[PDB]
Coordinates of N, CA and C in Angstrom, one line a residue:
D1 N 89.7 84.7 133.7 CA 89.3 85.8 134.5 C 89.4 87.1 133.8
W2 N 90.6 87.4 133.2 CA 90.9 88.5 132.4 C 90.0 88.5 131.2
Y3 N 89.8 87.4 130.6 CA 88.9 87.2 129.5 C 88.2 85.8 129.6
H4 N 87.1 85.7 128.9 CA 86.4 84.4 128.7 C 86.1 84.2 127.3
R5 N 86.2 82.9 126.8 CA 85.7 82.6 125.5 C 84.2 82.4 125.7
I6 N 83.4 83.1 124.8 CA 82.0 83.0 124.8 C 81.4 81.9 123.9
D7 N 81.9 81.9 122.7 CA 81.6 80.7 121.8 C 82.9 80.4 121.0
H8 N 82.7 79.7 119.9 CA 83.8 79.2 119.1 C 84.4 80.4 118.3
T9 N 83.7 81.5 118.2 CA 84.3 82.7 117.5 C 84.7 83.8 118.5
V10 N 83.8 84.1 119.4 CA 84.0 85.3 120.2 C 84.5 85.1 121.6
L11 N 85.5 86.0 122.0 CA 86.0 86.0 123.3 C 85.7 87.4 123.9
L12 N 85.5 87.5 125.2 CA 85.1 88.7 125.9 C 86.1 89.0 127.0
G13 N 86.8 90.2 127.0 CA 87.7 90.4 128.1 C 88.1 91.9 128.3
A14 N 89.0 92.1 129.3 CA 89.5 93.4 129.7 C 90.6 93.8 128.7
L15 N 91.2 95.0 128.9 CA 92.2 95.5 128.0 C 93.3 94.4 127.7
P16 N 93.5 94.2 126.4 CA 94.5 93.2 126.0 C 95.9 93.9 126.1
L17 N 96.7 93.4 127.1 CA 98.1 93.9 127.2 C 98.9 93.4 126.1
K18 N 100.0 94.1 125.8 CA 100.9 93.6 124.7 C 101.4 92.2 124.9
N19 N 101.7 91.9 126.1 CA 102.2 90.6 126.4 C 101.2 89.4 126.2
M20 N 100.0 89.8 125.9 CA 98.9 88.8 125.7 C 98.7 88.4 124.3
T21 N 99.5 89.1 123.4 CA 99.3 89.0 122.0 C 99.5 87.6 121.5
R22 N 100.6 86.9 121.9 CA 100.9 85.6 121.4 C 99.8 84.6 121.9
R23 N 99.4 84.7 123.1 CA 98.3 83.8 123.6 C 97.0 84.0 122.8
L24 N 96.6 85.2 122.6 CA 95.4 85.5 121.8 C 95.5 85.0 120.4
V25 N 96.6 85.4 119.7 CA 96.7 85.0 118.3 C 97.0 83.5 118.1
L26 N 97.9 83.0 118.8 CA 98.3 81.6 118.6 C 97.4 80.6 119.3
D27 N 97.1 80.8 120.6 CA 96.3 79.9 121.3 C 94.8 80.0 121.1
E28 N 94.3 81.2 121.0 CA 92.9 81.5 120.8 C 92.5 81.7 119.3
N29 N 93.5 81.7 118.5 CA 93.3 82.0 117.0 C 92.5 83.3 116.8
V30 N 92.8 84.3 117.6 CA 92.3 85.6 117.4 C 92.9 86.3 116.2
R31 N 92.0 86.7 115.2 CA 92.5 87.4 114.0 C 91.7 88.7 113.7
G32 N 90.8 89.0 114.6 CA 90.1 90.3 114.6 C 90.0 90.7 116.0
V33 N 90.1 92.0 116.3 CA 89.9 92.6 117.6 C 88.9 93.8 117.6
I34 N 87.8 93.7 118.4 CA 86.9 94.8 118.5 C 87.2 95.6 119.8
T35 N 87.7 96.8 119.7 CA 88.1 97.6 120.8 C 87.0 98.6 121.1
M36 N 86.3 98.3 122.2 CA 85.3 99.3 122.7 C 86.0 100.2 123.8
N37 N 86.8 101.1 123.3 CA 87.6 101.9 124.2 C 87.9 103.3 123.5
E38 N 88.2 104.3 124.3 CA 88.7 105.5 123.9 C 90.2 105.5 123.7
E39 N 90.8 106.4 123.0 CA 92.2 106.5 122.7 C 93.0 106.6 124.1
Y40 N 92.5 107.4 125.0 CA 93.2 107.6 126.2 C 93.2 106.4 127.1
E41 N 92.3 105.5 126.9 CA 92.2 104.2 127.6 C 93.2 103.1 127.2
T42 N 93.5 103.1 125.9 CA 94.3 102.0 125.3 C 95.8 102.5 125.1
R43 N 96.0 103.8 125.2 CA 97.3 104.3 125.0 C 98.3 103.7 125.9
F44 N 99.5 103.3 125.3 CA 100.6 102.7 126.1 C 100.4 101.2 126.4
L45 N 99.2 100.8 126.9 CA 99.0 99.5 127.4 C 98.7 98.5 126.3
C46 N 98.0 98.9 125.2 CA 97.6 98.0 124.2 C 98.3 98.2 122.8
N47 N 98.3 97.2 122.0 CA 98.8 97.3 120.7 C 98.1 98.4 119.9
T48 N 98.9 99.1 119.1 CA 98.3 100.1 118.2 C 97.7 99.2 117.0
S49 N 96.9 99.9 116.2 CA 96.3 99.2 115.0 C 97.4 98.6 114.2
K50 N 98.5 99.3 114.1 CA 99.6 98.7 113.3 C 100.3 97.5 113.9
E51 N 100.5 97.6 115.2 CA 101.1 96.5 116.0 C 100.2 95.2 115.9
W52 N 98.9 95.5 116.0 CA 97.9 94.3 115.8 C 98.1 93.7 114.5
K53 N 98.1 94.6 113.4 CA 98.2 94.1 112.1 C 99.4 93.3 111.8
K54 N 100.6 93.8 112.4 CA 101.8 93.1 112.3 C 101.7 91.7 113.0
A55 N 100.8 91.6 113.9 CA 100.7 90.3 114.7 C 99.7 89.4 114.0
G56 N 99.1 89.9 112.9 CA 98.1 89.1 112.1 C 96.7 89.3 112.4
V57 N 96.4 90.5 113.0 CA 95.0 90.8 113.4 C 94.5 92.2 113.0
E58 N 93.3 92.2 112.5 CA 92.6 93.5 112.1 C 91.9 94.1 113.3
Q59 N 92.1 95.3 113.6 CA 91.5 96.0 114.7 C 90.3 96.9 114.3
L60 N 89.2 96.7 114.9 CA 88.0 97.6 114.7 C 87.8 98.4 116.0
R61 N 87.8 99.7 115.9 CA 87.6 100.5 117.1 C 86.2 101.2 117.1
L62 N 85.5 101.1 118.3 CA 84.2 101.7 118.4 C 84.1 102.5 119.8
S63 N 83.6 103.7 119.7 CA 83.5 104.5 121.0 C 82.1 104.7 121.5
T64 N 82.1 105.2 122.7 CA 80.8 105.6 123.4 C 80.9 107.0 124.0
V65 N 79.8 107.7 124.3 CA 79.8 109.0 124.8 C 80.3 109.1 126.2
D66 N 79.7 108.3 127.1 CA 80.1 108.4 128.5 C 80.4 107.0 129.2
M67 N 80.5 107.0 130.5 CA 80.9 105.8 131.2 C 79.7 104.8 131.4
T68 N 78.5 105.2 131.0 CA 77.4 104.2 131.0 C 77.6 103.2 129.8
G69 N 78.5 103.6 128.9 CA 79.0 102.7 127.9 C 78.0 102.2 126.9
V70 N 77.2 103.1 126.3 CA 76.2 102.8 125.4 C 76.6 103.1 123.9
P71 N 76.7 102.0 123.1 CA 77.0 102.2 121.7 C 75.7 102.6 120.9
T72 N 75.9 103.2 119.7 CA 74.8 103.5 118.8 C 74.4 102.2 118.1
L73 N 73.2 102.2 117.5 CA 72.8 101.1 116.7 C 73.7 100.8 115.6
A74 N 74.2 101.9 114.9 CA 75.1 101.8 113.8 C 76.4 101.1 114.2
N75 N 77.0 101.5 115.3 CA 78.2 100.9 115.7 C 78.0 99.4 116.2
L76 N 76.8 99.1 116.6 CA 76.4 97.7 116.9 C 76.5 96.8 115.7
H77 N 75.8 97.3 114.6 CA 75.8 96.5 113.4 C 77.2 96.4 112.8
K78 N 77.9 97.5 112.8 CA 79.3 97.4 112.3 C 80.1 96.4 113.1
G79 N 80.0 96.4 114.4 CA 80.7 95.4 115.3 C 80.3 94.0 115.0
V80 N 79.0 93.7 114.9 CA 78.5 92.4 114.7 C 78.9 91.8 113.4
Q81 N 78.8 92.6 112.3 CA 79.2 92.2 111.0 C 80.7 91.9 110.9
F82 N 81.5 92.6 111.7 CA 82.9 92.4 111.8 C 83.2 91.0 112.4
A83 N 82.5 90.7 113.5 CA 82.6 89.4 114.1 C 82.2 88.3 113.2
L84 N 81.1 88.5 112.5 CA 80.5 87.5 111.5 C 81.5 87.2 110.4
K85 N 82.3 88.2 110.0 CA 83.3 88.0 109.0 C 84.3 87.0 109.4
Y86 N 84.8 87.1 110.6 CA 85.8 86.1 111.1 C 85.2 84.8 111.4
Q87 N 83.9 84.8 111.9 CA 83.2 83.5 112.1 C 83.2 82.7 110.7
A88 N 82.9 83.4 109.7 CA 82.9 82.8 108.3 C 84.2 82.2 107.9
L89 N 85.3 82.8 108.5 CA 86.6 82.4 108.1 C 87.1 81.3 109.1
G90 N 86.3 80.9 110.1 CA 86.7 80.0 111.1 C 87.7 80.5 112.0
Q91 N 87.7 81.8 112.2 CA 88.7 82.5 113.0 C 88.0 83.2 114.2
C92 N 88.8 83.6 115.2 CA 88.3 84.2 116.4 C 88.4 85.7 116.6
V93 N 87.6 86.3 117.4 CA 87.5 87.7 117.6 C 87.6 88.0 119.1
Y94 N 88.5 88.9 119.5 CA 88.6 89.3 120.8 C 87.9 90.6 121.0
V95 N 86.8 90.6 121.7 CA 85.9 91.8 121.9 C 86.2 92.3 123.3
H96 N 86.7 93.5 123.4 CA 87.2 94.0 124.7 C 86.8 95.5 125.0
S97 N 86.8 95.8 126.3 CA 86.7 97.2 126.7 C 87.8 97.3 127.8
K98 N 87.6 98.2 128.8 CA 88.6 98.3 129.8 C 88.6 97.1 130.8
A99 N 87.4 96.8 131.3 CA 87.2 95.7 132.3 C 86.6 94.5 131.6
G100 N 86.1 94.6 130.4 CA 85.4 93.5 129.8 C 84.1 93.2 130.5
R101 N 83.4 94.2 131.1 CA 82.3 94.1 131.9 C 81.0 94.7 131.3
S102 N 81.1 95.7 130.5 CA 80.0 96.5 130.2 C 79.9 96.8 128.7
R103 N 80.8 97.7 128.2 CA 80.8 98.1 126.8 C 81.0 96.9 125.9
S104 N 81.9 96.1 126.2 CA 82.2 94.9 125.5 C 81.2 93.8 125.6
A105 N 80.6 93.7 126.8 CA 79.5 92.7 127.1 C 78.3 93.1 126.2
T106 N 78.1 94.4 126.1 CA 77.0 94.8 125.3 C 77.2 94.5 123.8
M107 N 78.4 94.7 123.3 CA 78.8 94.3 121.9 C 78.6 92.8 121.7
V108 N 79.0 92.0 122.7 CA 78.9 90.5 122.6 C 77.4 90.1 122.6
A109 N 76.7 90.8 123.4 CA 75.2 90.5 123.5 C 74.6 90.7 122.2
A110 N 74.9 91.8 121.5 CA 74.4 92.1 120.2 C 74.7 91.1 119.2
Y111 N 76.0 90.6 119.2 CA 76.4 89.5 118.3 C 75.6 88.2 118.6
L112 N 75.3 87.9 119.8 CA 74.5 86.7 120.2 C 73.1 86.9 119.7
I113 N 72.5 88.1 119.9 CA 71.2 88.4 119.4 C 71.0 88.1 117.9
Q114 N 72.0 88.6 117.2 CA 72.0 88.4 115.7 C 72.2 86.9 115.3
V115 N 73.1 86.2 116.1 CA 73.4 84.8 115.7 C 72.3 83.8 116.1
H116 N 71.7 84.0 117.2 CA 70.7 83.0 117.7 C 69.3 83.6 117.7
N117 N 69.1 84.8 117.4 CA 67.8 85.5 117.5 C 67.3 85.5 119.0
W118 N 68.3 85.4 119.9 CA 68.0 85.5 121.3 C 67.5 86.9 121.7
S119 N 66.7 87.0 122.7 CA 66.4 88.3 123.3 C 67.6 88.9 124.0
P120 N 67.6 90.2 124.2 CA 68.8 90.8 125.0 C 69.0 90.1 126.3
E121 N 67.9 89.9 127.1 CA 68.0 89.3 128.4 C 68.6 87.9 128.3
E122 N 68.2 87.1 127.3 CA 68.8 85.8 127.1 C 70.2 85.9 126.8
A123 N 70.6 86.8 125.9 CA 72.0 87.0 125.5 C 72.8 87.4 126.7
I124 N 72.3 88.3 127.5 CA 73.0 88.8 128.7 C 73.2 87.6 129.7
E125 N 72.1 86.9 129.9 CA 72.2 85.7 130.8 C 73.2 84.7 130.4
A126 N 73.3 84.4 129.1 CA 74.3 83.5 128.6 C 75.7 84.0 128.8
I127 N 75.9 85.3 128.7 CA 77.3 85.8 128.9 C 77.6 85.7 130.4
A128 N 76.6 86.1 131.3 CA 76.8 86.1 132.7 C 77.1 84.7 133.3
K129 N 76.6 83.7 132.6 CA 76.8 82.3 133.0 C 78.3 82.0 132.9
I130 N 79.0 82.7 132.0 CA 80.4 82.4 131.7 C 81.3 83.5 132.4
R131 N 80.9 84.7 132.2 CA 81.7 85.8 132.8 C 80.8 86.5 133.9
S132 N 81.0 86.1 135.1 CA 80.1 86.5 136.2 C 79.9 88.0 136.4
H133 N 81.0 88.8 136.4 CA 81.0 90.2 136.8 C 80.5 91.2 135.8
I134 N 80.0 90.7 134.7 CA 79.5 91.7 133.7 C 78.4 92.6 134.2
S135 N 78.3 93.8 133.6 CA 77.3 94.7 134.1 C 76.7 95.5 133.0
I136 N 75.4 95.2 132.6 CA 74.7 95.9 131.6 C 73.8 97.0 132.2
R137 N 74.0 98.2 131.8 CA 73.3 99.3 132.3 C 71.9 99.5 131.5
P138 N 70.9 100.1 132.1 CA 69.6 100.1 131.6 C 69.6 100.8 130.2
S139 N 70.5 101.8 130.0 CA 70.7 102.4 128.7 C 71.2 101.5 127.7
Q140 N 72.1 100.6 128.1 CA 72.7 99.6 127.2 C 71.7 98.5 126.9
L141 N 70.9 98.2 127.9 CA 69.8 97.2 127.6 C 68.8 97.7 126.6
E142 N 68.5 99.0 126.6 CA 67.5 99.6 125.7 C 68.0 99.6 124.2
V143 N 69.3 99.9 124.0 CA 69.8 99.8 122.6 C 69.8 98.4 122.1
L144 N 70.1 97.4 123.0 CA 70.0 96.0 122.7 C 68.6 95.6 122.3
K145 N 67.6 96.1 122.9 CA 66.2 95.8 122.5 C 65.9 96.4 121.2
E146 N 66.5 97.6 120.9 CA 66.3 98.2 119.6 C 67.0 97.4 118.5
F147 N 68.2 96.9 118.8 CA 68.9 96.1 117.9 C 68.1 94.8 117.6
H148 N 67.6 94.1 118.6 CA 66.8 92.9 118.4 C 65.6 93.2 117.5
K149 N 65.0 94.4 117.7 CA 63.9 94.8 116.8 C 64.3 94.9 115.4
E150 N 65.4 95.6 115.1 CA 65.9 95.7 113.7 C 66.2 94.4 113.1
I151 N 66.9 93.5 113.9 CA 67.2 92.2 113.4 C 66.0 91.4 113.0
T152 N 64.9 91.5 113.8 CA 63.7 90.8 113.5 C 62.9 91.4 112.3
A153 N 62.8 92.7 112.3 CA 62.1 93.3 111.2 C 62.8 93.0 109.9
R154 N 64.1 93.0 109.9 CA 64.9 92.7 108.7 C 64.7 91.3 108.3
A155 N 64.5 90.4 109.2 CA 64.3 89.0 108.9 C 62.9 88.7 108.3
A156 N 62.0 89.6 108.5 CA 60.6 89.5 108.0 C 60.5 90.0 106.5

């Protein structure tokens, strides 16, 4: 409920509390973390970059302008390539935001688009089958369509 495994590499969830570190690292084999959050959101509640590293995981932090939670294309590619790095290692990646409903769902959708060449709607549908309460905003949907375009153009 707090989080869901999406595939063999990626998990999608809400803020990772410090007491969840052992479960994520040991049980879920999480060795990378993508933090779709602002500093004021993760302060106190989450591992710092250093605390993550001490626990055996590399943190990647990505921000957005407002509460509609829309990442730039650049941050999308950065995030996806990060996830792909750990996939190649046979290791897992915890992709999170505050609620694991929107900003993080968008990041996971981008990863799925890249991995399967799925459309944004197909990617979103796949996530929703597993994590019911996700919420993609129209602005988030549009950047995902742009991402799919770049992925496809690149493949040509």
